[PDB]
Structure formats: structure tokens, C-alpha cells
Amino acid sequence: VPLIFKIGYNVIPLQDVILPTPSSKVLKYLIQSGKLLPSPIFISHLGLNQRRIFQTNGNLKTISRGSKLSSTIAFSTPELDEGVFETIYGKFHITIESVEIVEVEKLKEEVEKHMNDNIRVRFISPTLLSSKVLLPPSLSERYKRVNAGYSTLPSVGLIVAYAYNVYCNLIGKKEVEVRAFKFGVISNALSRIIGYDLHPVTIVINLRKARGVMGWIEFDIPDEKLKRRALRYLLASSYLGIGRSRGIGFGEIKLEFIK
Amino acid sequence: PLIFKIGYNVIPLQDVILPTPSSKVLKYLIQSGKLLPSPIFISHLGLNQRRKTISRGSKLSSTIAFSTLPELDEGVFETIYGKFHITIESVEIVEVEKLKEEVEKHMNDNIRVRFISPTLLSSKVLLPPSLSERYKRVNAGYSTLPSVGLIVAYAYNVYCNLIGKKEVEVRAFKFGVISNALSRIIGYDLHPVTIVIGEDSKGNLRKARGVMGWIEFDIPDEKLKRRALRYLLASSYLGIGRSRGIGFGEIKLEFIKR
């Protein structure tokens, strides 16, 4: 039976530390060297006071001994330990805050609770969605030279199209560009936007920079069948993140349902 | 066909209580044949460069725009809302063909669209026309966060009416879908607004929810940009979206050098 794991870590530096860029490198180092988990993967930036530490670009961030940093790792389809770990960035006490295991089928069931609820998507970390996902695939060649970049104001259609793609990979089915496109186009046509607070952000992936979006958007899809699909897909993205560079912590979303 | 864009100075000779929308004042004049013999746009009245109880002497401004010659006078006009001194601040006469020529000056410029008055764009303009019947019952309302595609789609429609050609839903749809796919959004400050549009058949107040603010963007495909500039340029005279004849959907178009 295929599953999604979402582990919440507490990460406490035992000495004053300078976090790497991106700050997800700390836990990535651990995982790579086989020290944290044996290895559709998401490794968050380290967070503090409900803000992720990502570099847009000033000086590097100092964290004092004892600060409670948090992290999330998420992946599909593995036993997990904690304790004091040594790293090139310093020594860290890593304990587990939470463990969520969701069966892909149980996602469909939670959708039903929210059929009459509005949808709030929050971009908790800068999110990088490519606009061309809503280009009709038959025109890919024609516009091959066009560099649209990442959307700094993504439409509901683009968001859910990205979610549908993540969902397909999650359930192990090949994503189909045409279904994604059609789904997003129709969603842009029919969605109702209730409110939003969006803004551009420029982030560091010498330096290589990218421009995406952060903030939140609240909306509804007033077609039962289309809403049911969107909720399912969004729910999956809420575990694995969305858009480019999720494995490094970008595209972190939090999904909220407003009664 | 030509486009006329007249800027009026509108000075109430007595303290006045403006109707809702405030464009009703000049609309009354035009309808009764008093301001012009008669693709039309009548702005809301503006004060201190922003679109209520208005004191005697306040310098309100208005803009009226329409397509085809000039037979326009000035002076004191009587209205159910009071007496007003209306003079002409400016007249722009632009040939529809000269629009195509100004497009070329801006091929390398970014595009800033500002919604100066609440703008009411229906999202369903980007619904594939073949699905209109299927989603007949779905009420999407007006977009409170319109995408570049929706904006330029609406512009294309206005342009068609301007040059007297029937708007084609399918061309609008395709043009907006492709524009959403390829546009680059540089910056923005948008927000929802819920406003009173006017009365209805029965006299009940009607509300609507739309957008105001600005959005800056580019279309990095030469051929598509050239089309979009032309259509946008036309919208910058005639406004955009629903209820332009009543002053909604007023846009100002700015080209940012790079």
C-alpha cells in the first residue's frame, strides 16, 4: 500500500551556528550520508518564529546555541531515529515533533469533509511555478524560444495544474501535459477568488537567482466535480510541496479550509 | 473610424449630491441630447485625480471616449443633480491605423496596466466556448485577481468592436490562454473592491465585486506582444470589462523603458 510520510523535526544547535544556503542543507547532509534516514521528496528550509530561513540575499544568518529550529521532510511510499548529530555545519540535537502517515486513499476521504469549504493556499516558502504548464502542449515547439520564467502571480489554474502533476507522480501514474493544461484552463475560467496577499520574491537557488511567489490566496471552485478533483490534488501537494526545487525546500504550501 | 477622447472640467455651481455611479451626471446630458448628438466610455467624475457631497466650485474632471465629425460645445448645463459648468480640457483624436504605428515604439518596453476605476472582468471569457452550455449554471462572477490573459482577452474584444468586427469568443479564449502561458509578470499591486454599480430595473441597489490596482508585465514573444499592444492601446481609450459606458474598467496604460 503506497503512503506519504511527513516528519516534523526539532533541530537544536548545541553551539552558535551559521546555517548554510539553503538551510535545508543541514538535514540533507545527514540524509545523504545515511545518518538520518536510509536514502517525490521534500526537505524544508529550517524555520524559526514561524518563518523559513531562505536566502534572498543579505548577510548569512546566525543562530544561537539552544534555538528551536524546525524542519519538515516529506516523501512517498523506513524507520527513523533522533539524537545528537555531528555535521560540517556543527552539532545538532534532532528530535521528532510529529509523524503523519497518510494512505493515498485516505486523501480522497478527507476531500469530502471540505466540499462546502473555501480553499486557502499559503506559500510558506518561495514557490517557483512555470507558466508554460498552461501552454497548450501542441504549441510547445512554436514557443520553444520564449522564456516565460516562473510566475510571480500564479493563477488558481496554474496552482492546481501543478498539484495535479504532483498527484499523478504520487499515485505512480505518468503525468499527462494535456490533462494538466485542460484542468488549469478550466479552473481559471470557473474559480472564484475570495481574497489574497501575494508578492514576488527573488531567492538564491557564483550566485544563481530565481523569482517566484509567496503569500496566500483564498478561493473556491463552484463546480462539484472539479472541486473534488482540485481538493484531492492540493491535499497531496500539501505534503510534497509544489513547483521547482522542492527537494531543497521551495514550494512549501500549507492548505487551509475556511468554513 | 476615429477615436475621440475628450477631457472635461465639470464644476458644480451649487453644492451637489452626486449620483451612483457619478458618471450618471454626464450620461443624463448625453442621453437627453444636450452634450453630444447620438464603443462608448463615460468616466466617473474625479476629484484631486481620484475617481458623495461636493461643494460649489470644486473642479471635477471627466473623460468621455467613443469611436466613429466634431460638434461639441461648452458652458452651463442643467441637470436633475444640479447645474454644472462644463468646459473642455483636452481633445485627442486618434486614427485606428495610427494605433498600429505606436505599437512599434513599445516593442521593447514593459507594459503597465492600471485599473483607475473598479474593473469588472468575467473569468468565463477564458472558458473554452464549447463548454459554455455545460457550465451554464456556474456563477464565477467577476475576477478579483485577473490574469494577464483575461486582461488582454478583454482588450481584444474591445478592439474588435472598435474596428466594427464581431468579437469571436474562440479567438479571445485562445489569445488569453496563450497569453497566460507566456507572460512574465514584473510587479503588481492589486486588490478586490466591492462597489455599488447603480440601481436596477426595480430601483434596488446592485453590488459587484471587481479589481483595482496595477499590474506590470511583458510578453516575450514578438508576434503575440504586437497583437497585445494594439488591443491594449485601444482599451486605453474605451476602457475594459463590463459597464464601461457607466465608467467602470477605466485603465491607464504605461510603457516602462528598459
Numbering used by the authors:
A (entry chain A): 1 to 39, 52 to 89, 95 to 222, 229 to 282
B (entry chain B): 2 to 39, 52 to 64, 73 to 89, 94 to 283
Q: What do the authors say?
A:
In type I and III systems, pre-crRNA is processed by the Cas6 endonuclease, whereas type II systems utilize an alternative method involving host RNase III. Cas6 proteins typically consist of two tandem RRM (RNA-recognition motif)-like folds {also known as RAMP (repeat-associated mysterious protein) domains } with a diagnostic glycine-rich loop near the C-terminus. In the present paper, we report the crystal structure and accompanying biochemical data for Cas6 from the crenarchaeon Sulfolobus solfataricus. The crystal structure of S. solfataricus Cas6 has revealed a dimeric organization that may be relevant for its in vivo function as a stand-alone crRNA-processing endonuclease.
Although native SsoCas6 crystallized readily, reductive methylation of the surface lysine residues was required to produce well-diffracting crystals. A selenomethionine derivative of the methylated protein was used to solve the structure with a SAD dataset collected to 2.8 Å (1 Å=0.1 nm) resolution. Residues 43–50 and 90–93 are disordered in each of the four monomers in the crystallographic asymmetric unit. The monomer consists of eleven β-strands and eight helices arranged as two tandem RAMP folds linked by a single helix, consistent with the canonical Cas6 fold. The N-terminal RAMP domain of SsoCas6 deviates from the standard motif in that the second RAMP helix (α2) that normally precedes β4 is missing and replaced by a loop with an extended conformation. In the C-terminal RAMP domain, there are three additional helices located on the helical face of the domain as well as a β-hairpin that connects two strands of the central β-sheet. Analysis with the PDBePISA server indicates that the four SsoCas6 monomers in the asymmetric unit assemble into two identical dimers (complexation significance score of 1), consistent with gel-filtration data that also suggested a dimer. The dimer interface was formed between the C-terminal domains of both proteins with an average buried surface area of 1349 Å2. The three non-conserved helices of the C-terminal domain are positioned at the interface and may be responsible for causing dimerization in a Cas6 protein that is typically monomeric. In fact, there were no histidine residues located around the putative active site.
